[PDB]
Ligand binder design. Structure first.
Ligand SMILES: *C(=O)c1ccc(-c2ccc(C(=O)OCC)cn2)nc1
Ligand SMILES: *NNC(=O)c1ccc(-c2ccc(C(N)=O)cn2)nc1
Ligand SMILES: CCc1ccccc1
Ligand SMILES: CCc1ccccc1
Ligand SMILES: CCc1ccccc1
Ligand SMILES: CCc1ccccc1
Length: 9
């Protein structure tokens, strides 16, 4: 989950 978001950065 964290990674799913972190791709933005
Ligand atoms: C959410 O974006 C998220 C959570 C956890 C994972 C993930 C990917 C790969 C592994 C892995 O290779 O584990 C080896 C024990 C674990 N968790 N991806 C995305
Ligand atoms: N928001 N994330 C990025 O801008 C980003 C993170 C990580 C990478 C990247 C690219 C290539 C490798 C590799 N070949 O091991 C690892 N991480 N790009 C963009
Ligand atoms: C449903 C959001 C999500 C994304 C990736 C991993 C787990 C959960
Ligand atoms: C963690 C990378 C990812 C995101 C969404 C769906 C599958 C795999
Ligand atoms: C900026 C694109 C995006 C949207 C949602 C989650 C991650 C990345
Ligand atoms: C940031 C890791 C990742 C990989 C594939 C897809 C989304 C996110």
């Amino acid at each position: 989950l964290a990674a799913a978001l972190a791709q933005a950065l």
